[PDB]
Design a protein around this ligand. Structure first.
Ligand SMILES: [Ca+2]
Ligand SMILES: [Ca+2]
Ligand SMILES: [Ca+2]
Ligand SMILES: [Ca+2]
Lengths: 142, 142, 141
């Protein structure tokens, strides 16, 4: 499938030295490439819970397992539309970008400023300050 | 409203509380709110209706019958007036009718916050998945 | 006998509620003020008693609307808890109302982390609004 090919591509973006193995350092550079700022403790955690070998590295299968845990949808039904509706105060299909930013930064598994910024650049296409959350849901589950 | 609606209420309650613990989990509330008969019933999607109702939750995330009843009824009764005095009277009646004392537990948190949190977790999760997807896309070329 | 909880009360005004050993009650920015921990006991249906754990002092309310500190359990230690806009928790007095208007006297703090009088705290004002950050559930006598 195209799936495993994308996994090969990912491993390909990851291996600078091409040793077949991902290090805590490399995890670091990647997480940072996503816009996160993990601690060494957090990385050692991210490894320890997913390491089967405990080789400090991630081979293709372990990469598969981890990406599988991340990609699987748990509370996602595409009726995440409901989740947006929870915050759509007047139900007009639009949420002001400000409110969205506040909510995302102050509630739940809060997003970083980088994450929020990108999310907002993606969600407010016309930059009018109003966000058509349904189109965002379509885009998001493409 | 009539006595029939209240008897019906206790009837559904015995179904949702087969042990007469005088409490239900919030996750099921929607279902229960949809399970009733008219006019007390709140058909799905009822989530907003449930979120606008003053609905206290004890630990852990459990709600008591008196609050649910009072709210569902008050939605029909509108503001009061005599219906509030009758509300207090019927509340006392329910207290007296209730066996034991252990079911008296103090308020912890409430609805909105729970559903908002779940919503946030959902959106964050999905967003993360799409970040991953985009990164792999960056990998493919080349 | 009674199934209550232990918790920290965070005022929306921006402080952790603090019952100091000397009976002085205020709002603090200190996370670990052990005077900020409290015993919530359901002394009835939506009626709760609040106790400063460090001083074992009941947060009682006398005849003037002042939240003094008390050792003995008086019915003045009774508080009618209620949610505001399904988002904030408020504890009112079972004795106090604007006896004409019926507007109850609530526990409340000003913007400076200082305690307010009962009749000056409005239900709709940020003073009366509190968020319980719980620790554990406990059984009481
Ligand atoms: Ca490597
Ligand atoms: Ca390995
Ligand atoms: Ca809106
Ligand atoms: Ca827009």
């Amino acid at each position: 499938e195209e799936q495993i090919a994308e996994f090969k591509e990912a491993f390909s973006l990851f291996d600078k030295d091409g040793d077949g193995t991902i290090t805590t350092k490399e995890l670091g550079t990647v997480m940072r490439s996503l816009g996160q700022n993990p601690t060494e403790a957090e990385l050692q955690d991210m490894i320890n819970e997913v390491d089967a070998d405990g080789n400090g590295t991630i081979d293709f299968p372990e990469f598969l397992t981890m990406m599988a845990r991340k990609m699987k949808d748990t509370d996602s039904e595409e009726e995440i539309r409901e989740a947006f509706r929870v915050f759509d105060k007047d139900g007009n299909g639009y949420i002001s970008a400000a409110e969205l930013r506040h909510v995302m930064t102050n509630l739940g598994e809060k997003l970083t400023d980088e994450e929020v910024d990108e999310m907002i650049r993606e969600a407010d296409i016309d930059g009018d300050g109003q966000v058509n959350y349904e189109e965002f849901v379509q885009m998001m589950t493409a | 409203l009539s006595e029939d609606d209240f008897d019906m209420f206790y009837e559904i309650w015995e179904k949702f509380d087969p042990e007469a613990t005088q409490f239900i989990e919030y996750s099921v509330l929607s279902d229960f709110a949809d399970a009733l008969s008219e006019p007390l019933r709140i058909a799905k999607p009822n989530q907003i209706s449930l979120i606008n109702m003053d609905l206290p939750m004890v630990s852990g995330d459990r709600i008591h019958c008196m609050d649910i009843l009072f709210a569902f009824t008050k939605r029909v009764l509108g503001e009061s007036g005599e219906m509030d005095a009758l509300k207090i009277q019927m509340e006392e009646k329910f207290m007296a009718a209730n066996p034991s004392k252990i079911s008296y537990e103090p308020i912890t948190t409430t609805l909105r916050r729970k559903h908002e949190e779940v919503s946030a977790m959902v959106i964050q999760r999905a967003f993360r998945r799409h970040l991953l997807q985009r990164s792999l896309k960056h990998a493919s070329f080349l | 006998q009674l199934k209550g909880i232990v918790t920290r009360l965070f005022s929306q005004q921006g402080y952790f509620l603090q019952m100091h050993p000397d009976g002085t009650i205020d709002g603090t920015k200190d996370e670990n003020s052990d005077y900020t921990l409290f015993n919530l006991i359901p002394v009835g249906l939506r009626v709760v008693a609040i106790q400063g754990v460090k001083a074992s002092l009941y947060v009682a309310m006398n005849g003037e609307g002042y939240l003094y500190s008390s050792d003995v359990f008086t019915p003045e230690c009774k508080f009618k808890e209620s949610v505001f806009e399904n988002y904030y928790v408020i504890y009112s007095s079972t004795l106090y109302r604007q006896q004409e208007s019926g507007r109850a006297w609530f526990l409340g703090l000003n913007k400076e982390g200082q305690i307010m009088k009962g009749n000056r705290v409005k239900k709709t004002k940020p003073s009366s609004h509190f968020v319980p950050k719980p620790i554990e559930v406990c059984m009481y006598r």
